[PDB]
Ligand binder design. Structure first.
Ligand SMILES: [Ca+2]
Lengths: 13, 127
């Protein structure tokens, strides 16, 4: 089993 | 409407031009299917460039390369829409919208094959 990768983290403005 | 290559491209072009931020979830689900199908039109060798282009498009750090590439790789190798369905279930709507928007912004302009030999041959045919 391979978990779904997390979505990309965007830089905070 | 049969799902030919050209129909796929025309569909992608249409939705690339839409602002999908307020789209119905049912349509967003179908767009994820579209992105998965379109991803599989790329040679495996092109997934790294797809990832890199996505990062640049979205102003993402290189530390985000691993998860983004993994998504593209697992869509590319997906069978029976298993990973696609897991991705849809796990991710939040906003993340999905952003990813799909980015993909549709880059997928139509990126070469689907990288092989130098292949690219050379095909160049002599392009009208
Ligand atoms: Ca767009």
């Amino acid at each position: 089993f391979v978990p779904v990768p997390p979505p990309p983290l965007y830089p905070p403005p | 409407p049969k799902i030919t290559l050209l129909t796929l491209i025309k569909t992608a072009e249409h939705w690339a031009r839409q602002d999908i931020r307020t789209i119905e979830d049912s349509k967003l689900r179908a767009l994820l299917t579209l992105c998965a199908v379109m991803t599989r039109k790329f040679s495996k060798s092109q997934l790294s460039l797809l990832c890199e282009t996505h990062l640049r498009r979205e102003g993402l750090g290189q530390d985000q390369a691993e998860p983004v590439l993994e998504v593209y790789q697992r869509l590319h190798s997906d069978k029976g829409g298993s990973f696609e369905a897991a991705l849809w279930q796990q991710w939040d709507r906003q993340s999905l919208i952003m990813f799909i928007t980015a993909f549709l912004n880059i997928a139509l302009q990126l070469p689907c094959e990288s092989s130098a030999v292949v690219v050379s041959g095909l160049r002599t045919l392009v009208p």
